[PDB]
Each structure stands twice: as C-alpha cells, then as structure tokens.
Design a protein around this ligand. Structure first.
Ligand SMILES: OC[C@H]1O[C@H](O[C@@H]2[C@H](O)[C@@H](O)O[C@H](CO)[C@H]2O)[C@@H](O)[C@@H](O)[C@@H]1O
Ligand SMILES: [Ca+2]
Length: 128
C-alpha cells in the first residue's frame, strides 16, 4: 500500500498511534516518519492525507526546542516557515514537541502533544 513520489515510497497508516509508536512502526518497515523538503512534497502529502490528521517526522531537538526531522534531514527554518498553519507552532500547554499534517493547505503543520494518537506517514527511499 506504499505510494510513490519523487524517489520515495510513502505509507499512510490506517491505524492511529502516538508519535513515537508511529516512528517505531516506520522503523520496523525500514522507514521513518516523513520529512518534508519541498513545496511539491508538502502538496503531495496534504493532498494525499485528504483532510485527515497524520503524524509526520517533525520533533524537537536541542535545549532550545528547535524543530528537527527524525530522518535526520537538516531542518530549514527559513524554507519551512511557509508550511505551518498560521499561529503554529504555538507550543500549547507547553507540551507540543511533535508535529503533524493537520490542514489541507500548503500551510498544513501543527505542533501537538507527542502522546496523542493519530494516523501517520512513513517515508522510505527507493534505492535502484
Ligand atoms: O487553535 C490551535 C490549537 O488547536 C488545538 O488546541 C485546542 C483548540 O484550540 C481548542 O479546541 O481549544 C482547546 C482547549 O483549550 C485546545 O486544546 C491543538 O491542536 C493545538 O495544537 C493547536 O495549536
Ligand atoms: Ca499547536
């Protein structure tokens, strides 16, 4: 059930999990919760999500609470600014340290508590 886009396969889960249990599922399938590195990938993801909320690979790193990608893609604060929902990340309840795709818009991301359960998206490279 993996979908193909620009050199990567993506798995849109049918069962919801916490952010970390989701990541562990992806890891068990030789993948990671997805990074987002272009407008075209953001568009593929939010369009495919079809208005449902999915965990993606966004999570905090370092003392300073900087956002990062679990697949180790360097996080580009400048180039990613256009991808959050207006007002996010807002760090609500001082307890939102993971990120999901929420709005079907280029401005799609929300920060949410890592222990909330949502559907999730794994990303696996194709290696010819
Ligand atoms: O408004 C953005 C905000 O939405 C969600 O927070 C909840 C809502 O704002 C609303 O239902 O009020 C709730 C109680 O105060 C609040 O929890 C979250 O998805 C949050 O991450 C987001 O920033
Ligand atoms: Ca939030």
């Amino acid at each position: 059930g993996w979908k193909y886009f620009k050199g990567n396969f993506y798995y849109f889960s049918l069962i919801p999990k916490t952010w970390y249990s989701a990541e562990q599922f992806c890891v068990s399938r030789n993948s990671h919760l997805t990074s987002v590195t272009s407008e075209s990938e953001q568009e593929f993801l939010y369009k495919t999500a079809g208005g449902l909320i999915y965990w993606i690979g966004l999570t905090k790193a370092g003392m300073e609470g900087d956002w990062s990608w679990v697949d180790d893609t360097p996080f580009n604060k400048v180039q990613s600014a256009r991808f959050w929902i207006p007002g996010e990340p807002n760090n609500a309840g001082n307890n939102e340290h993971c990120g999901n795709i929420k709005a079907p818009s280029l401005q799609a991301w929300n920060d949410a508590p890592c222990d909330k359960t949502f559907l999730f998206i794994c990303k696996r490279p194709y290696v010819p």
